[PDB]
Amino acid sequence: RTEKIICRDVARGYENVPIPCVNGVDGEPCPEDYKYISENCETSTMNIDRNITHLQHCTCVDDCSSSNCLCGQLSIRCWYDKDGRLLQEFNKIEPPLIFECNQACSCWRNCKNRVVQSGIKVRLQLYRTAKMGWGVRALQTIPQGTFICEYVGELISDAEADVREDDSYLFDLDEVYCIDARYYGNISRFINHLCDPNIIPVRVFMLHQDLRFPRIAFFSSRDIRTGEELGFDYGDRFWDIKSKYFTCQCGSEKCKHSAEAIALEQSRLAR
Amino acid sequence: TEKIICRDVARGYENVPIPCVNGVDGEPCPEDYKYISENCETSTMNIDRNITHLQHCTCVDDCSSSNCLCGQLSIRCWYDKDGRLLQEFNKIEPPLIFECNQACSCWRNCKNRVVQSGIKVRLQLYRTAKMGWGVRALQTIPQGTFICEYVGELISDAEADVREDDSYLFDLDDGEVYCIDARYYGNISRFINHLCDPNIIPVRVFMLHQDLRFPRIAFFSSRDIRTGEELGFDYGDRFWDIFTCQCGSEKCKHSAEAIAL
């Protein structure tokens, strides 16, 4: 079998870079049961607070590289190095919310605290995996801490998420709001679960500071090689709903959710 | 002597820098406002942003055919292949323009996305002889070219009635009345002066939402504009009824001399 480019850009020109799709595995055509969007959408009344006078903002007249930047101080510090990468010291167990600079700040649009709002810069590819359906892989080396993409979809309420039948694309922001990428989503809806993940989600605020709606940004948690599949840990809660339907195919020696890992735990509980 | 007093009054928010110069007097770069590249809110406007309420096209091409719903909503698509308004465009009573949006099936680079792609022409903020600050072209600009949007603070009818200074107040004009006030928050368009012989015209456009209470205001050149020419639109007789005009045209109808006659 031969690899087959089946779409030049699944984003239809909406991202900074094209995101091609290939399938060198089976006969599945390019996925089209969803609407690609590059930014979050709403399908009910949400009234995101966008009052420009409500925004916390900085007075910096440099590039916001100093510890005096207010937006960095709201994040405890700015966690971006000079190349726009997330610092290794960033705490994954208890991450602070990231507050990027915004339209109320006195700084320029190219200051050092605007990584996520500047969008996708790495070359990604939608591709057919051997055992998980569609997936996303890197077409380049990606250093640790690099911004990858945002989890984009339909903003819905807690109550609406209870009503939704399919939560295979439902991200819990943790009233409680979620992002459902089932019907509307970006490239992130195709990122699979890995028990040994190489990206992590981070909560970020940019052009609004409405605390019901953090945006979810994925950053690499280690150096990523060309061709390597991207994935994050969906979390035990997702698997406590979903392992009755399918089991994990990540194949890692550390896999916590495989058919066998579940059976081994069940046999320890019996013994 | 002409001094450059700002490399970019937009602070990097537009596609191009917009420098400011002064070769007339001692006035420094204007700083009594906040530059913003898109409209802002200072109170709850409840703009309908429901993606399922958008009318949108099913175009599998570049939206240059007559089956594009978004062009049909605008009577036709009025943009030529270069993104300029057609010569047949009603420059006196323009129709509403519906550009393609996030619900359309077309690509982001189809032919119906001129205003949402932002400023392309090179402009300069500069100190005029008699009108304070103004905006001029640093290049020739063909007729029908998109210049910039009138950007500011969205305010209600009642809020506009309470405001003291309407020198930056654009009336969006059935239904609830709203205004764009660029006094406190605005982009480069807040500096465009009135001309009785204008060379740009405002056009109402819809892009990412279709809440008909809140058209966005796009300025297009109404004729070929020469390099160095000051940009201006006709503020309208209502503004002048509710300083005297220094436009200098032989057709100026708001001058001190005109008002006295």
Ligand SMILES: CCOc1ccc(NC(=O)[C@H](/C=C/C2CC2)NC(=O)c2ccc(Nc3ccncc3)cc2)cn1
């Ligand atoms: C820095 C942040 O760290 C995080 C945060 C979140 C994650 N992981 C997830 O969010 C996970 C994502 C699954 C992939 C398909 C997208 N999805 C879920 O847990 C999930 C949970 C509950 C649920 N149901 C209801 C929820 C609310 N109200 C009512 C019902 C649906 C899905 C990882 N790291």
Ligand SMILES: CCOc1ccc(NC(=O)[C@H](/C=C/C2CC2)NC(=O)c2ccc(Nc3ccncc3)cc2)cn1
């Ligand atoms: C759509 C294309 O057609 C148009 C439309 C409008 C224009 N021209 C103007 O909009 C004009 C703009 C003046 C320049 C300084 C910005 N401004 C005004 O008429 C104006 C009117 C009333 C007012 N006051 C209140 C209003 C409501 N409620 C309370 C008070 C303030 C300003 C030209 N062509």
Ligand SMILES: Nc1ncnc2c1ncn2[C@@H]1O[C@H](C[C@@H](N)CC[C@H](N)C(=O)O)[C@@H](O)[C@H]1O
């Ligand atoms: N580690 C995994 N093992 C098996 N299936 C997975 C795994 N991670 C994701 N999936 C599958 O992908 C769904 C989640 C999607 N967000 C990911 C894109 C999906 N692979 C697709 O082809 O559309 C899950 O409901 C599973 O069907």
Ligand SMILES: Nc1ncnc2c1ncn2[C@@H]1O[C@H](C[C@@H](N)CC[C@H](N)C(=O)O)[C@@H](O)[C@H]1O
């Ligand atoms: N044709 C004109 N003649 C005299 N003054 C004008 C004319 N057009 C605009 N102005 C002045 O500019 C104001 C409108 C502003 N939106 C334009 C920018 C203004 N020139 C400034 O320096 O900030 C008016 O209140 C007038 O002060």
Ligand SMILES: [Zn+2]
């Ligand atoms: Zn700062």
Ligand SMILES: [Zn+2]
């Ligand atoms: Zn900044």
Ligand SMILES: [Zn+2]
């Ligand atoms: Zn800031």
Ligand SMILES: [Zn+2]
């Ligand atoms: Zn696993």
Ligand SMILES: [Zn+2]
């Ligand atoms: Zn179309």
Ligand SMILES: [Zn+2]
């Ligand atoms: Zn289109």
Ligand SMILES: [Zn+2]
């Ligand atoms: Zn369209």
Ligand SMILES: [Zn+2]
């Ligand atoms: Zn005049």
